[PDB]
Amino acid sequence: GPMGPTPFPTAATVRDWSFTLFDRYEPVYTPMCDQCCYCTFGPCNLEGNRRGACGLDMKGQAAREFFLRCITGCACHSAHGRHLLDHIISIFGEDMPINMGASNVIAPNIQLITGRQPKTLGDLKPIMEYVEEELGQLLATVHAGQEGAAIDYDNKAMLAGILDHVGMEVSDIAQVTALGFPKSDPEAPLVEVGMGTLDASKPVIIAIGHNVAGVTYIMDYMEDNNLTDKMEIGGLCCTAFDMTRYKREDRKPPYAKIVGTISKELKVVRSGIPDVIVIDEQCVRADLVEEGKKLKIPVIASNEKVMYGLPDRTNDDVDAIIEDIKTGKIPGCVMLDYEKLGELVPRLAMEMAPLREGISAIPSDEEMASLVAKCVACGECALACPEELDIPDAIQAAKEGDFTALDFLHDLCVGCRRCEQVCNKEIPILSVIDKAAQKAIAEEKGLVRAGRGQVSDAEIRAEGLNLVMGTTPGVIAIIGCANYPAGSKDVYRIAEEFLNRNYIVAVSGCSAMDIGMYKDADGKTLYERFPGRFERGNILNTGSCVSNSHISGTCHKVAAIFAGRNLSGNLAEIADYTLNRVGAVGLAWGAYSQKAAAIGTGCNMYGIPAVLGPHSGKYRRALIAKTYDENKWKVYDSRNGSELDIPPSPEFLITTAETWQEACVLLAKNCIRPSDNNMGRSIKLTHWIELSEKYLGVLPEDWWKFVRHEADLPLSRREELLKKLETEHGWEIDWKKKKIISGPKIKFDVSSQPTNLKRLCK
Amino acid sequence: PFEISPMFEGERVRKEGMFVELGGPKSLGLELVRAKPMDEIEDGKVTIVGPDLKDMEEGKTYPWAMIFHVGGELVEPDLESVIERRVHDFINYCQGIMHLNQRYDVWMRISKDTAAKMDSFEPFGKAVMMLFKTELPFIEKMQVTFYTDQAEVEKQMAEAMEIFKARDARTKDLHDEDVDVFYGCTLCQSFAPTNVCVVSPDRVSLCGAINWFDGRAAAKVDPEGPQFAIEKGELLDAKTGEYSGVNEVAKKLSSGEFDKIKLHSFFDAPHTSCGCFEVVGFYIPEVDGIGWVNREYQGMAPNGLGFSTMAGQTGGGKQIVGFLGIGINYFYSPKFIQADGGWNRVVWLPSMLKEKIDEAIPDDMKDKIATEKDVTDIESLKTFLKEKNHPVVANWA
Amino acid sequence: VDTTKNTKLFTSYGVKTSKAITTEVAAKLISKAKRPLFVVGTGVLDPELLDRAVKIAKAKNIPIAATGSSMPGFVDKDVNAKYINLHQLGFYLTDPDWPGLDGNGNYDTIILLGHKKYYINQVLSAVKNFSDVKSISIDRNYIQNATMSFGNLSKADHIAALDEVIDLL
């Protein structure tokens, strides 16, 4: 029916909104290099904001690099979605209706961007097509001499981010509708997570990747032959969530297990636990064969994206492949036929379990003593460590029978092996750390909730009242990868702190795995302490990486439920509404991948601020606003069209934080919105002040910038803060009524409607 | 003493980690707020009769009646219950103190560390009184009395029973003609800009969290805030609940979206809902009836739509004719959709909603409303209303 | 205690590189700053590092930007310190019109102590490429993107160098 101005958008159509965002949130470029390696006219030295042979300055180069990362992430999501959709339509038919959950808008991102309302599975076919076409255009911008300004690369990156969100939504909708995933279930079944959950007394299959097509066939073969009680299947990365959501809408406990994030990927292979490894698409270490052939661990590729230089045995007989892998020259094969793979992997694991027994890279106690005695403290390993761990100090401590420093370093290490390749003594430091933390690994057991899907249109209404009556301080979306600066406990600490204050915490991806890994002193995890509903003090795990499209979609639904705004082709309107009214902040503590960059950029284009880990400064682009400049904090009143002041929150669209206390303070502060009433503003100020005092020893210096009314102040210390306002700031206050009569620079008016667009003013 | 913060609301003091249990199922617990003139009320005073915090033994249960005496220039007993409605939250603002239920079902516990730190009941009552004076500033003076003897608590509980019965009767007998002002709420305008809400004694608010007394107390706290008082003025239609003052205030605060708002009406300028209604109401035109669906119903109505779809067409602060959002206590209103025939128009209801609101359906219309068990499709609904003589049969010619 | 010895890196940001200075040159540059800003990180919470940082800041009345969660260390102390994000500080330093923490104007030279390499290097990339604010690194890691920096040092060597710099301020 009614359509907005931007259906099927391009770089020109979303230029106005992106430019409006960049006028307030200026881009900050932190180049990862002083040179350009792109074309034979180079490499060009752009240091000091100089120009290349093509006239491109270093700011433009950084913008182009970030744009390339965003489009690579978008391409990954869209290609995974396209392959999943094609397989699903081939197997289940093109007329299958979309069954996502109890909702009014089943595809909020698709409706928001394209403007269409898909009903069946085939309705998703054109949308994917559009995305891929646009991808080509965007990819054409990576060519040399294809853009001169950095702002035009930032706008194209924003377009790439929103297209990425569309692709993730398409993929998740297809997979959930087809493979019987949980449909917005607040009581999703719990699944074990950790390296100490795989019983080494049974054959072990380990699936690494992000797809689920072949994993479903493997599980079907296991179930049909009743091998589920004697063979253990584990998942690394998002395929663990995808396999633990398979047919789990009935809440039956799943036999599949979750091993961990990318960090564990090599470590498990080092332990000899896996008996067969299958690799699907992405987040797969490019040296699994190198460290697996040493332990006689077969590695099987299953997708054309990743063939790992292996022989292609697709058109063959399973028995011959089994015999060659068992006693032969090939450490694996590429098996692109899904039925053949689902039949081959279980039999191969069964026949390899009794033959690879007693093989692991963990050194003996005497072997580890000799290894720790071999070091000379040359400092190369600490120089090559991505996390800058103090390896030589730990080795020096362990030289005298003190194996606890390596035990501490085990959690901080990411298992990247970069320290081993610079050691002239050939000391396997990763295996040394694993040997020192063997007992801790054996103790690693946790529980996580399976992917519920999207948030239903009933929980949003149930939580809107709590958000407007000042009982829900905001929404925190803990997502991203697992390249943490100081171990996997930081996400757990942040989630626990925000759940203790009755926030709405939504988790997905590797962060959910690394949060559900720390049991409490009572032997409980956060998912068991707090239910999986969309309500205050509750934590819900949406699912795999492609489930993040739901979280952003949730924001869109808030615009489409309480305000009644049209979603079809209304990117600018809904983005403005989310930026001005909805209090939701994303947190990507360990993001490394280009997919994380695409997700963060797409969230920024929807108006959702994000705080990332200290490593994310390597992404070369952030979006920060100048607090001091008062002329960049003005909007229009959608009733008068006049200029209206707003508090300086959110003060960034994407930023980085070093420690988790700083992240907690930033997340608490950035939940504030200009349109907040007295109760919401009061509760947000309360929590922000409390967190600042607890984690910084001081209370914020800009708190007074968020006090429009005497009801804006916290309840506990109202008089203590009013006295400070009168004394430190000189405001005029009445003491009998405890009322601020003068001093605020913005009079409270709940009916005011902030807008960044002049085209929607009376 | 301790630290007051809204963080310690989920703090559950378990039986293995608590000094003393106050009230609960085994004992008899009570809380009460009483309004008195501002000459017998002493601010910053707590009277404790019998045992105190330092005269108690671990792992026991005590009656623990709490009585609050408030006093102020603009304080009347009609808001007493309103004050009680906050007591719970305030008790859950003190770290290590757990409060459960309200009225005469209270259950307050105390933690080991908190009990060892306070050593008396004076600071806790003082903190509670300071919060209630900070929250509702019109309360000039406040005093608390704590009873821990079984006999005294039984006497106070008998008095509280009589007081609660009187209060419930007074609340029930209140009507729209016993008052001269309604109360407007615009707190939802943070997410629904052009949405105004009007609450009257004969029409509970949209979300169920606001009544006439709640809005009245909020307006007393801040007259010019988002909770304000409306003068009804000249009544224009008693059947359709039209008031000139309400009409003009809606026109002013609606940014010119709806000119009129007719209370207790379904098709003529109905009340405007944002998204937060506890109950939604749809109009079946084939049967010329009204059905209602609550937020928790996972089934589908006879038209084939659930709560989400049928609530996605009545919201945004607009005034679309058809589906209407209401609360849960609106069924008990005597003027419940009066200009639509009232209960004579309700045709379908889910089983849970009927079992919940049985007290509102008249004895003659109880065997006249379909349920999901009885009716699955629209033809089944027609046959059911043809068999059981629903008054909507007459409208079919 | 010679700091200009281990100028060793794992990766290179290009051809332009930091100058490895001695204790005397660092003391002279700190004492000759027109408007210095002691940018400190969460890694200064080590008691020796915290004491040396407080002594350095109070020796020349240098205002402190306690980036990260380093503020609780300076609450009990006397040095004028304010909290600010490191990324936000890097964005602000590339603006000549920024009033600063005191509102007296933008800064000239920033002293860095107690930071992670991959973070301070990323911020210093923008700072040193899109502004003229000089950076002096007195950390035990050799920072490439700083204008002047110490070399790769042991913790005892770093403590000794900081003490010598204190005695030469």
Ligand code: SF4
């Ligand atoms: S960005 Fe990387 S590939 Fe490009 S010039 Fe710099 S170091 Fe080389």
Ligand code: SF4
């Ligand atoms: S693209 Fe431009 S800056 Fe890069 S190498 Fe080629 S000419 Fe030099």
Ligand code: SF4
């Ligand atoms: S690289 Fe090897 S020899 Fe050098 S310090 Fe590290 S462990 Fe010791």
Ligand code: SF4
């Ligand atoms: S494997 Fe671990 S310890 Fe070695 S360099 Fe990588 S992160 Fe550092």
Ligand code: SF4
């Ligand atoms: S729905 Fe309730 S809380 Fe919201 S504006 Fe209306 S009366 Fe107020």
Ligand code: NI
């Ligand atoms: Ni509402």
Ligand code: NI
């Ligand atoms: Ni509503």
